[PDB]
Amino acid sequence: DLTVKMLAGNEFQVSLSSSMSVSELKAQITQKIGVHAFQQRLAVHPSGVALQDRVPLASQGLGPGSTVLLVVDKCDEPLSILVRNNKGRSSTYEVRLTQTVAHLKQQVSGLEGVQDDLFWLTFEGKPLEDQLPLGEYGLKPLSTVFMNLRL
Amino acid sequence: DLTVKMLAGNEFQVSLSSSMSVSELKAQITQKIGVHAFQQRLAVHPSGVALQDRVPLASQGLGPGSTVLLVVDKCDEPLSILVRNNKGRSSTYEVRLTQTVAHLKQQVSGLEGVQDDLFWLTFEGKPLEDQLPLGEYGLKPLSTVFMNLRL
Amino acid sequence: TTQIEVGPGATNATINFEAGILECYERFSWQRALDYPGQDRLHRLKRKLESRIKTHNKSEPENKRMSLEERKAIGVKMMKVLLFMDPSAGIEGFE
Amino acid sequence: TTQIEVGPGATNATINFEAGILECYERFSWQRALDYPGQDRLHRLKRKLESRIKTHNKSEPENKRMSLEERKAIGVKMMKVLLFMDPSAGIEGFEPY
């Protein structure tokens, strides 16, 4: 088991299997306490040195029974993106990375005048999932999300 | 002639008479805005590098037209010292570096039962002055202050 | 205006965090940059803060009780971690 | 309770300082550490502060006009130097101990 320590002393445990990996640690934390992965800043205790997403946890100064530090970077600074409708017409939307893909779709529905279950969004080839926050897809100012029509 | 810039961004001028020492600069800042020397934290603009005491300002890149940054530290935290009455009996007093010498003499007066006008305090040979802060003399935990009687 | 669910440990955490907040207000006032309305917000937060610490302390064992000055130190470290986003500021704040 | 004579420029200084205080409340809030009354003081401060900025921005030239988000950056800078009582790199470039 691994111990996660947050600001103000709160603690909880995480089980890492089969092998150690930063990417998985964050996914684990997300399931435990609901903190989005892209907001997680992990550091070794008591070193205070940030973990590195690439290198596994065993290959670092980290292992079993060791403590990690979690600080949550809100990453909720407003920004604007573009969503291109089926006809090729792109419109801007004010969003925050902490809002859900579902919330962006509600914004797109109203503007584009199309029911949300009648389409899905894609960014850089891959589809966006309703339950996930926009920040998981690394969207940037005036990025172009594409609208795709169901049947 | 030098520009002092405080935390808010407000500036005021200070003309260095001769030596152009940091001690002199602080003395002028005390005369100007009333901040005691021991409370002044000075640094170069805009590097932020702190001023060096035993070094001439003209040596740290501080000539006419230069700007120094002032941060005030009250130094209000409690410490204990000793006052030795004429007999040789040392007794402990709790004080703050911001309290005046007159204030301290009031404590000594109350404990020793001697009117303040009938004695004067000394530290390391030099007299303490009524209207000056205790921080003015670099009093440390359990520094000995001697009590001197008058005719 | 979006609330974040917390647990019991957040009460004593907020008291310390806001202690540090007070310590910053105070240091700022030394710079003579704190306007009059702002000075009132300083004095009231200290008033309430002392009222909450006194109320919280009695609710907890003596060996865990802390003074206004003791909590300030903890709050300062916590604030350094948030501003620099680095546990090194830091560690005393727990991360 | 002793007071401190301020000066005209205190108004702007306090808006930025408290703008940094808000940034600290918010950041603390995401650590699941801010209790409910705390989160109330957070949102109250944000409202009050936001109205103060609009009121103060009308009287100043467009160049020195600052929005809540960019004022924050200034407030945290102040907070940094205060927390360390050290302008010395406390604001400009890194330097944490």
UniProtKB/Swiss-Prot annotation, chains A, B:
Q: Does Disulfide bond appear among the keywords?
A: yes
Keyword match Transmembrane: no
**Which organs or tissues contain this protein?**
Detected in lymphoid cells, striated and smooth muscle, several epithelia and neurons. Expressed in neutrophils, monocytes and lymphocytes. Enhanced expression seen in pancreatic adenocarcinoma, endometrial cancer, and bladder cancer, as compared to non-cancerous tissue. In bladder cancer, the increase in expression exhibits a striking positive correlation with more advanced stages of the disease.
Gene Ontology CC: cytoplasm; cytosol; extracellular region; nucleoplasm; nucleus
Localization, UniProt: Cytoplasm; Secreted
Give the source's domain of life in one word: Eukaryota
Induction (UniProt): Strongly induced upon exposure to type I interferons, viruses, LPS, and other stresses, including certain genotoxic stresses.
Q: Which GO terms describe its biological process?
A: defense response to bacterium; defense response to virus; innate immune response; integrin-mediated signaling pathway; ISG15-protein conjugation; modification-dependent protein catabolic process; negative regulation of protein ubiquitination; negative regulation of type I interferon-mediated signaling pathway
Q: Name one GO molecular function term.
A: integrin binding
The Ubiquitin-like domain is annotated at 1-75, 76-151
Which residues are reported to carry the modification S-nitrosocysteine? C75
Its assembly, as annotated, is:
Homodimer; disulfide-linked. Interacts with, and is conjugated to its targets by UBE1L (E1 enzyme) and UBE2E2 (E2 enzyme). Interacts with NEDD4. Interacts with PARP12; this interaction inhibits PINK1/Parkin-dependent mitophagy.
The associated disease is: Immunodeficiency 38, with basal ganglia calcification: A primary immunodeficiency predisposing individuals to severe clinical disease upon infection with weakly virulent mycobacteria, including Mycobacterium bovis Bacille Calmette-Guerin (BCG) vaccines. Patients are also susceptible to Salmonella and Mycobacterium tuberculosis infections. Affected individuals have intracranial calcification.
Q: What is known of its domains?
A: Both the Ubiquitin-like 1 and Ubiquitin-like 2 domains are required for its efficient conjugation to cellular proteins. The two domains play different roles in the ISGylation pathway: Ubiquitin-like 2 domain is necessary for the first two steps allowing the linking of ISG15 to the E1 and E2 enzymes while Ubiquitin-like 1 domain is essential for the final, E3-mediated transfer of ISG15, from the E2 to the Lys of the target protein.
UniProt name for this protein = Ubiquitin-like protein ISG15
The organism of origin for this protein? Homo sapiens (Human)
Curated annotation (Swiss-Prot), chain C:
Which ranges belong to the motif Nuclear localization signal?
A: 44-49
> Quick one: effect of changing R27A?
Partial loss of dsRNA-binding and no effect on inhibition of IFN-beta promoter
Q: What is the effect of changing K72A?
A: Complete loss of dsRNA-binding and inhibition of IFN-beta promoter
The record lists the membrane-crossing segments as none
> Outcome of K80A?
No effect on dsRNA-binding and 45% loss of inhibition of IFN-beta promoter
Impact when changing R44A: Complete loss of dsRNA-binding and 40% loss of inhibition of IFN-beta promoter
Q: Cite the residue spans of the region called G1P2-binding.
A: 1-95
Please state where this protein is localized.
Answer: Host cytoplasm; Host nucleus
- RNA-binding and homodimerization: annotated segments: 1-87
Phenotypic consequence of R52A: Complete loss of dsRNA-binding and 20% loss of inhibition of IFN-beta promoter
Please give the family membership noted in the entry. Answer: Belongs to the influenza B viruses NS1 family.
Domain text:
Both N-terminus and C-terminus can inhibit IFN-beta promoter activation and IRF-3 nuclear translocation.
Subunit structure of this entry? Homodimer. Interacts with and inhibits human G1P2 conjugation by UBE1L.
- Provide the function of this protein: Binds and inhibits the conjugation of the ubiquitin-like G1P2/ISG15 protein to its target proteins. Since G1P2/ISG15 is an early antiviral protein, NS1 may inhibit the host antiviral response. Prevents EIF2AK2/PKR activation, either by binding double strand RNA or by interacting directly with EIF2AK2/PKR. Also binds poly(A) and U6 snRNA.
Q: What is the recorded name of this protein?
A: Non-structural protein 1
Q: Which organism is it from?
A: Influenza B virus (strain B/Lee/1940)
Q: Which residues of the full protein are shown?
A: 7 to 101 of 281
